[PDB]
Amino acid sequence: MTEYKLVVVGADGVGKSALTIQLIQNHFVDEYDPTIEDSYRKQVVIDGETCLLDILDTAGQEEYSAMRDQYMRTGEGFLCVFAINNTKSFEDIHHYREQIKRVKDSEDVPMVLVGNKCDLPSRTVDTKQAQDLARSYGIPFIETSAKTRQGVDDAFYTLVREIRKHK
Ligand SMILES: Cc1c(F)cc2[nH]ncc2c1-c1c(C2CC2)cc2c(N3C[C@@H]4C[C@H]3CN4)nc(OC3CCOCC3)nc2c1OCc1ccccc1
Ligand SMILES: Nc1nc2c(ncn2[C@@H]2O[C@H](COP(=O)(O)OP(=O)(O)O)[C@@H](O)[C@H]2O)c(=O)[nH]1
Ligand SMILES: [Mg+2]
């Protein structure tokens, strides 16, 4: 009944939509239209307290706009997703954190770094690299696979805990 607005961001193809659909509907999407941006609702019990997650699965191209800022400003907590087999998506994380800090006008914005696709046998972005960056920013790092569900509940529940600390 308490509602939290979560926003999922990250490079094309990292698994923003797969993460969100795995959480909400307990299955893995092979192909979810990369241009569909929408919010999906899911009720969960975290540390014994029921809440409603209202999760904005972002899409878009690479445009800046104040309009997009308004959508982004609705968020209370942000999942910043890269894929462990996509160096460029890891490189893009700093941009996402900078813009979210700007929109939220705060340096402590509830946020989790998510390294998705951890089911894959070869990573180009090592655990050490991601963990170092998360530690610099003062946010948790959680490895996930939207495919197997490994870490998925942990990533979203951690973000909720981060929000609850923030309030
Ligand atoms: C976070 C954020 C914000 F918080 C507030 C905002 N207001 N307006 C946009 C925006 C964004 C935003 C988003 C919003 C989450 C929807 C997605 C992407 C984005 N993506 C969305 C999907 C995956 C990927 C391509 N398709 N990619 C890039 O690429 C960057 C371009 C500049 O060079 C470095 C990389 N920027 C994005 C972006 O910032 C735009 C930008 C912002 C400021 C300056 C230049 C470019
Ligand atoms: N192996 C693997 N593939 C994944 C994982 N998450 C997403 N994918 C795939 O990566 C592609 C992009 O996922 P999608 O969620 O649409 O990415 P988005 O552009 O970030 O919304 C799809 O083919 C997904 O099935 C994961 O954890 N493991
Ligand atoms: Mg998507």
CA torsion sign for 84, 127, 159, 148 is positive
The ligand 2 atom at the shortest distance from the C-alpha of residue 32 is 16
Phi-psi domain of 5 (left: phi exceeds 0; alpha: psi -120 through 50; beta: other): beta
12 lines ligand 1 (CB under 6 A): yes
Element (H, E) at 49: strand 49-57
Which residue, 154, 82, 72, 73, is CA-closest to 113? 82
Which residue, 58, 13, 19, is CA-closest to 142? 19
Looking up tokens 């089911």, which residue turns up? 119
* CATH number for the segment(s) 1-167: 3.40.50.300
What is the spatial distance between Cα 33 and Cα 17, in angstroms, rounded to a whole number? Answer: 9
Name the structure determination technique.
Answer: X-ray
Q: Are 15 and 89 in contact (CB under 8 A)?
A: no
The resolution, in angstroms to one decimal, equals 1.4
Q: Whose CA is nearest to atom 18 of ligand 1?
A: 62
Looking up tokens 């939509």, which residue turns up? 17
What is the spatial distance between Cα 56 and Cα 44, in angstroms, rounded to a whole number? Answer: 16
15 lines ligand 2 (CB under 6 A): yes
65 lines ligand 1 (CB under 6 A): yes
